[PDB]
């Protein structure tokens with residue numbers, strides 16, 4: 001059931017913003033590791049004396065990396081005279097965020113019809129304001145409300161190229177990397193208590209529960225067309241293996257964004273290219289499942305994947321799961337930085353053709369029982 | 381003249397330590413960009429609840445990248461019970477350093493005969509103590525004194541693999557990159573006032589002035605065999621083109637390390653490999669000199685380099701200069717991070733064979749007049 005109860009018109013995910021201490025090094029690492037092109041910049045060379053911001057793109061996926069300069073460069077400025085291109089940015093908030101959480105996501109940004117209306121309706125419905133609507137060059141409106149922890153949900157609306165004040169990067173500095181990643185599929189938060197978090201977010205957005213079918217409890221909030229998907233996890237205490245959600249909260253100093261799932265148009269190519277680079281500056285992946293898991297895949301998905309395509313899943317360590325409506329190919333990176341906090345999922349979905357409907361195949365819940373069972377089978 | 385006046389026995393440069401906010405991303409970027417292998421680690425996986433430290437090596441060059449974890453992970457510890465592998469590390473100092481200066485060098489480390497004696501003699505001769513001698517696993521002694529700004533000179537002595545508590549990295553995580561870089565040739569600091577800085581450092585080390593032959597004034601301090609070389613720059617005010625040393629001090633929030641010069645055993649190969657990667661996660665280089673500069677190179681170094689080797693310098697944008705005793709090949713990267721502060725020089729020296737004596741060919745001072753003249757010639 002989808003009650004289509006969004007309180008304002010939401011389009012798609014627009015970008016993800018990481019707060020960094022050095023945006024250059026993180027952006028360059030991510031570009032090489034994920035196959036994203038340097039697309040736009042806002043920094044000293046564009047007149048921004050406040051923050052350095054670099055945008056990476058792959059298809060429709062937009063990753064923004066921002067770090068603060070010395071406050072001394074802008075000590076004469078006031079908000080009416082700011083040279084910042086993102087008016088919500090604050091030196092103190094950014095340093096506080098990075099020192100507290102380490103490298104991580106500050107903003108989950110969605111495109112909406114009218115960011116000023118989205119902000120007003122959100123706050124009228126319980127959202128905690130973080131940055132009021134600001135109109136940039138009479139062309140784009142940006143506003144922010146608290147999502148969970150120190151992560152904000154950012155609303156962006158366009159009257160009619162990223163943001164005003166950003167410049168397109170020179171072709172000589174912009175290498176056309178592409179490993180097949182095309183868009184953000186979902187963004188997942190970890191919180192201490194799931195119930196109050198869902199009630200809060202569903203309260204101000206009108207997002208509905210998407211619904212599925214040890215360690216954690218989870219639920220997914222979804223927009224009207226189910227293209228904006230926001231899962232939230234809470235820990236389950238008292239187990240034998242300590243909850244990785246609890247480990248996250250401890251190392252992150254509280255709630256925050258746990259993983260970003262990036263859709264690939266060709267997950268085999270994406271993983272071939274990412275694994276080639278794991279030990280030369282890119283990203284590492286979680287350990288691969290035992291061969292008995294792939295032995296059991298023919299029995300579950302052998303009507304969706306050929307034997308050759310399943311052994312190709314085995315070569316790259318890809319996991320497969322299936323809903324009642326579609327099939328899911330997925331795999332997870334090791335944490336993106338020093339702390340065992342944020343990581344990336346690469347995903348491809350097959351089925352649910354109308355365009356493809358959102359969340360086709362689910363989020364992999366069935367792989368939990370399957371891997372425990374595969375662990376027992378490999379031991380035998 | 382070399383009075384050989386070192387107040388204690390100094391061996392060679394040992395390592396350079398960067399203080400980061402995320403050591404993983406900076407280390408991975410530097411590894412790919414410079415061709416350095418991941419050699420050793422000290423982090424959560426090695427029991428260090430205090431800081432993440434990753435060591436990159438190329439030949440004898442050692443780059444260490446360190447970032448703090450949440451202080452909460454080690455709140456029960458005291459210095460006698462620390463799980464830190466570098467006992468001088470302090471969460472507050474590191475966060476203060478990165479928030480003030482951005483990504484940069486915290487420690488210039490030299491190997492000495494006896495770090496406890498080096499520390500004692502240094503402080504007895506005016507050095508400001510930063511961290512007292514500490515013996516690690518009855519095997520290595522580490523001590524630190526202030527050098528300039530928030531940069532420390534770190535003394536390391538070995539009774540007899542980097543430091544105790546560091547583990548060798550798994551072969552699967554350690555790709556044998558190598559672009560030909562072999563050792564640190566010199567490390568250069570920027571200060572507001574050159575005279576007091578030289579008097580201070582030469583005062584506690586016994587290092588002597590190495591001696592050469594607009595924008596800045598400079599002098600080089602050298603150890604007994606002139607293998608540890610520490611140039612220091614000050615700005616010259618009142619020019620037309622504002623002093624890049626002054627720009628450094630402004631963007632860095634004061635004195636600090638300006639550039640690291642890395643010796644290559646094959647500067648042509650190093651630059652071919654580094655330039656291949658500039659736009660795919662590596663390092664960018666300064667603009668190349670006009671063709672008239674290379675037209676003038678035959679007249680100055682045509683007895684040292686063949687015509688083919690000079691046009692190869694032109695392809696890669698390499699600068700050449702010569703002392704009365706040797707020849708210098710050099711080139712400079714753009715700044716390593718967000719701020720226009722620290723950068724890298726790649727260097728190769730030819731001549732001065734006994735082994736090669738330190739500083740053979742100088743540091744490139746003659747290229748200043750040459751490029752101004754090349755600028756005038758290209759315009760014509």
Ligand SMILES: Cn1[nH]c(-c2ccccc2)c(C(=O)c2ccc(N3CCCCC3)cc2[N+](=O)[O-])c1=O
Pocket residue numbers: 186188218219220231259319332345363364365366367368369371
């Ligand atoms: C919304 N939603 N829920 C899960 C989810 C999490 C844990 C159990 C069930 C469902 C999402 C995932 O992405 C996900 C899927 C499978 C995973 N594993 C394979 C099986 C054994 C355990 C590890 C790990 C993750 N993960 O969260 O890292 C997700 O997006």
Ligand SMILES: Cn1[nH]c(-c2ccccc2)c(C(=O)c2ccc(N3CCCCC3)cc2[N+](=O)[O-])c1=O
Pocket residue numbers: 566568598599600611639699712725743744745746747748749751
């Ligand atoms: C100890 N010492 N002194 C210099 C030095 C600096 C500036 C003028 C003269 C000497 C050192 C250098 O490395 C260096 C050499 C040549 C450079 N350029 C080529 C000619 C036109 C200006 C730019 C830039 C740098 N630099 O400092 O970036 C150095 O190590």
Ligand SMILES: [Co+2]
Pocket residue numbers: 186188259261345363
């Ligand atoms: Co997921």
Ligand SMILES: [Co+2]
Pocket residue numbers: 566568639641725743
């Ligand atoms: Co130099």
